[PDB]
C-alpha cells in the first residue's frame, strides 16, 4: 500500500479511484511513480479516460511530471483520443509544450500514429508550430511515416499552408520530399490552387505558385519540378492546372 490506485486509474476504475484517493492524504503520493516512472495522470491519458483525468484535475495536481520527459499530453497524442486531449489542454495553456529529451512536442507525436482530429484541435488551440528538433519538422516525420490523412487535414486549415522550415543536410525540406515520398498529396494541395473564378464559359483563371523556392542561391534551381522528374511520380507532373502552364510560359523566354 498504496499500489492499486496506479492500476485502477490506469484503466480508469472510477469509483475505486474516487473512494481510495479521497481520504484525504493531501496527495503526497499523487504524485508518485515507479519504474519506468509514471503517474496516474499519465496512465489515464495513455489508455484514454476523460472521466478520471477530469476528476483528477478537479482535485488537480501535480499537473505535470515526466520520467522519459514525455509528459501526459504526449501519451494522449500518442493514440487518437479526443475528449481527454480537450479538457486536459483546456485546464492550462502554459503547461502544454515540452521539447525533450530529443526534441519533440505533442504535435510531433500526434502526427505519427494518431488520427487527424487531435491535430485539428491543437491548431484550434494555437499549439506551437515552429519548434524544430531533431532537424526534421513534425511534418517531415509525418510524411516519412507515409500518413495521408493528417497531412491532408492540416493543409485546409489553417495556420500554414506549407510552412517555412528547412535544412540540412538530412532531411531536405520541404515540399520536394512530399513529391518524392507521398505523391498525389500535391494533387489535392494543387486543385486548392487556381481559380476557375468564373464558372463555365468565358473564364480567365490565375495560377499562383508554391513551386519556386525561391532564390538566388547561385539552388538545384527550378528544384521541385526537377525532383518530380527525379523521382518519378507523374500523375502529378501531368496535372493540367499548374505545371504545364508554368513550363509553357517559362518556355516563352526559353523559346527566345
Amino acid at each position: 500500500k498504496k499500489s492499486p490506485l496506479h492500476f485502477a486509474a490506469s484503466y480508469g476504475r472510477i469509483n475505486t479511484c474516487q473512494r481510495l484517493l479521497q481520504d484525504i492524504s493531501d496527495t503526497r503520493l499523487l504524485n508518485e511513480g515507479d519504474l519506468h516512472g509514471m503517474t496516474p495522470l499519465h496512465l489515464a491519458a495513455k489508455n484514454g479516460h476523460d472521466k478520471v483525468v477530469q476528476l483528477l484535475l478537479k482535485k488537480g495536481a501535480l499537473f505535470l511530471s515526466d520520467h522519459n520527459g514525455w509528459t501526459a499530453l504526449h501519451h494522449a497524442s500518442m493514440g487518437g483520443y479526443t475528449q481527454t486531449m480537450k479538457v486536459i489542454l483546456d485546464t492550462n495553456l502554459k503547461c502544454t509544450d515540452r521539447l525533450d529529451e530529443d526534441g519533440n512536442t505533442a504535435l510531433h507525436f500526434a502526427a505519427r500514429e494518431g488520427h487527424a482530429k487531435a491535430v485539428a484541435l491543437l491548431l484550434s488551440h494555437n499549439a506551437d508550430i515552429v519548434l524544430n528538433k531533431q532537424q526534421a519538422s513534425f511534418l517531415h516525420l509525418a510524411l516519412h511515416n507515409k500518413r495521408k490523412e493528417v497531412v491532408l487535414t492540416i493543409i485546409r486549415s489553417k495556420r500554414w499552408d506549407e510552412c517555412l522550415k528547412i535544412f540540412s543536410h538530412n532531411s531536405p525540406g520541404n515540399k520536394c520530399p512530399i513529391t518524392e515520398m507521398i505523391e498525389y498529396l500535391p494533387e489535392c494541395m494543387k486543385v486548392l490552387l487556381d481559380f476557375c473564378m468564373l464558372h463555365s464559359t468565358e473564364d480567365k483563371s490565375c495560377r499562383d505558385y508554391y513551386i519556386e523556392y525561391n532564390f538566388k542561391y547561385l539552388y538545384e534551381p527550378l528544384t521541385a519540378l526537377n525532383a518530380m522528374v527525379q523521382n518519378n511520380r507523374i500523375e502529378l507532373l501531368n496535372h493540367p492546372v499548374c505545371k504545364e502552364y508554368l513550363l509553357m510560359k517559362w518556355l516563352a523566354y526559353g523559346f527566345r
Binding site: 483563371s205 495560377r207 499562383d208 510560359k249
Partner: protein
C-alpha cells in the same frame, strides 16, 4: 527495333518532360540573376495530351 521502341513509349512522357525540365535547369544556371523576374509573371490568365493508359 520493336522491342526497344515499345519500351521507350511504355514510359515516354517522362523522357520528354525530363527533356524540357533538364533544358530549363541548365539554362537557368548560366544566365545572370538580375535577368530574373522579369521575366516572370508568376501568374497566367487562362482562355492529344498525355495518355491515360500507362499506369502503376
Amino acid at each position: 527495333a520493336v522491342g526497344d521502341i515499345a519500351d521507350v513509349q511504355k514510359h515516354a512522357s517522362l523522357k520528354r518532360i525530363a527533356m524540357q525540365v533538364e533544358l530549363h535547369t541548365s539554362l537557368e544556371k548560366k544566365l545572370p540573376l538580375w535577368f530574373l523576374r522579369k521575366v516572370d509573371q508568376k501568374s497566367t490568365i487562362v482562355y492529344q495530351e498525355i495518355p491515360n493508359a500507362d499506369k502503376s
